[PDB]
From a paper:
The bisulfite prodrug GC376 converted to the aldehyde form (GC373) and attached covalently to the catalytic Cys142; both active sites were fully occupied by the covalent inhibitor. As previously seen in other Mpro cocrystal structures, the attachment of the aldehyde warhead can result in either (S) or (R)-configuration of the hemithioacetal to orient the hydroxyl group. The electron density was best fit with a 50/50 occupancy of (S)- and (R) configurations at both active sites (in the figures, only the (S) configuration is displayed for clarity). The inhibitor GC376 was bound with the glutamine mimic g-lactam at the P1 position, making direct interactions with Glu163 and inter-ligand stacking with the P3 benzyl ring in one of the protomers. At the active site of the other protomer, the P3 group was flipped such that the benzyl ring interacted with the protease instead of making inter-ligand interactions. The leucine side chain at the P2 position was tucked in the hydrophobic S2 subsite, consistent with the substrate amino acid preference at this position. The P2 group interacts mostly with Glu186, located in the 180s loop. In protomer A, where the P3 moiety bound in the same conformation as in SARS-CoV-2 Mpro, interactions with L162 were less extensive compared to the equivalent M165 while the leucine group of GC376 had considerably higher contacts with Glu186 of SW1 Mpro, compared to Gln189 at the equivalent location in SARS-CoV-2. These interactions were even more pronounced in protomer B where the P3 ring flipped to orient closer to Glu186.
Residue numbers in the entry:
A (entry chain B): 1 to 298
B (entry chain A): 1 to 218, 222 to 302
The structure:
Amino acid sequence: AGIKKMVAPSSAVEQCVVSVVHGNTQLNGLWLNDYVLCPRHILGKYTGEQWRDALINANNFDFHILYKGMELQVVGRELVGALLKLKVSMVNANTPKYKFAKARIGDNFSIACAYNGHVSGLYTVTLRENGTLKGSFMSGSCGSVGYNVTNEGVEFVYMHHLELPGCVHGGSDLHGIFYGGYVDEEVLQRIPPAPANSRNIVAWLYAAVYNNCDWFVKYGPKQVMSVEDFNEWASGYGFTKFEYHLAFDVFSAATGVSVEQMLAAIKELADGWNYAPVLGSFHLDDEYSPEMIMQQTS
Amino acid sequence: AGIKKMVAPSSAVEQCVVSVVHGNTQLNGLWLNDYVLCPRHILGKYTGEQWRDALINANNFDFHILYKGMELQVVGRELVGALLKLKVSMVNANTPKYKFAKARIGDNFSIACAYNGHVSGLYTVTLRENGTLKGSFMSGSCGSVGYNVTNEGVEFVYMHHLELPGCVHGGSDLHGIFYGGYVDEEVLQRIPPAPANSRNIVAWLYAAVYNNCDWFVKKQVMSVEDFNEWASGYGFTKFEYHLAFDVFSAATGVSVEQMLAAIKELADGWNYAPVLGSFHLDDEYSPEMIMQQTSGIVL
Ligand SMILES: *[C@H](O)[C@H](C[C@@H]1CCNC1=O)NC(=O)[C@H](CC(C)C)NC(=O)OCc1ccccc1
Ligand SMILES: *[C@H](O)[C@H](C[C@@H]1CCNC1=O)NC(=O)[C@H](CC(C)C)NC(=O)OCc1ccccc1
């Protein structure tokens, strides 16, 4: 029992994290095969077609790359979306089996938070409705990657670029595509809102029942709210339309609590509560994917 | 900016995690040098003096150990407090620089939660006043270790043994000493409740101020002496100094006494506005975990 934010083990990622320094810009890259990927603002702060011109005019010898104190010489440079791809003269002999994948809204993945080309800390994030994260990043952490680990190998899903006002973090996939409607420029940007993820909240409320925290359904006469009714309510109250997940078949069977009881709970609990904590909290938590809860309950 | 539960990188620990199976009992161990440590209940469910005799009567060949699917033959065995130390036929050539150290109350450390000798996920815990953790463990996860990564190398501080009432967890240090007043026996054990850690709450409120959330200090400061008297009757620990607070107070312009007054105001919860997303004081962040996440904040 117990419910925690589960990070994936980082050994395969650590063997790929490098520093990349150009001028006064210090950030991190990802070394796979014979190349390093890093955010294109390693070049400086540009917009639009200025990135291509900054690429043409840069010199490979001006990019200083280290892996654990060993220099990697840059022998080619190219832009890949919002990333620079720097070919280097040495193959990473510890390149893991890997794929590049896109995170889906509501998914968790793990951040290998790095400074000076060394991973300093790992943590879980959740991809929000507007393609942002609530992470923990300071100057020097750009190029930190987000990843998952499966039976097949590592999946790299994210590389960090920027912090929007309100501590809203933004980045790209490893093909250099930004995850939401923001760009890597220090100008004000209007971005769609981030409604609470109802699906994830249902997973967390099941987690609570698994852990004998069930006052919000076991006390008071049973209530249910239909999906249709819940969706119409949710659209006016800053929650996402409900989406089903196969985990809920397992959870509902094991707990005896239906999905419709959980939707009615969300509506009742949506302004918070003070009766008793739910998994330590007095507000609904949308940060856990159904996968993360299943891995800790069954 | 932002505040998250920060786990230490796991590469060094992963190269030490093994499965240990004895009969129907499946758990994990820690392979360092030419030995593996694992919980003694790999032997069965014994009590008190029976463990010594159960270890003496076991055969080395009845312990099956795998590292990443590779067999490690047990060639010796010894009881070390709550652990078995199983000598094996191969030295771990990836043994990191390490020490065994005791976590202190309020400390964070990272858990490498393992099943079948494979780390499935990591998370952070906080050593509570009564020597328990709020972790996440299922059957098969015993022998998972807690660790920190420091300048010197890895510090192994915890090995997992059991789940107590209330979804709380207990275990030992790597000398086999249990962290609180409990043992590895499946009988009801009464353990003293754990007050909220005031020191860590102070660190978390500083974290909020670093992140431009400071409504709760915006006078009436409270002295450490008055705070300690109030805390002793309200389920909070006495304040304890931590040298991170010299940095936090200077950077934020907010004194510890302001923060202690805030703890008293906020002790029953609030609903004015969130603090770092929360409506109750959070004691799960050590001052070291906050410092690591704020040291580069300019604003
Ligand atoms: C890269 O290391 C850094 C990460 C930031 C630093 C603070 N917290 C982060 O996540 N990224 C930047 O500094 C980034 C560089 C630009 C050229 C994209 N700029 C930034 O994040 O400034 C904050 C900001 C971004 C967009 C509009 C208004 C303010
Ligand atoms: C060892 O893997 C296991 C870890 C427990 C399993 C459930 N959650 C844990 O943390 N330890 C035990 O099973 C332990 C064995 C004794 C001989 C020490 N007994 C125990 O923890 O009893 C409580 C319990 C609660 C829920 C399921 C199984 C056991």
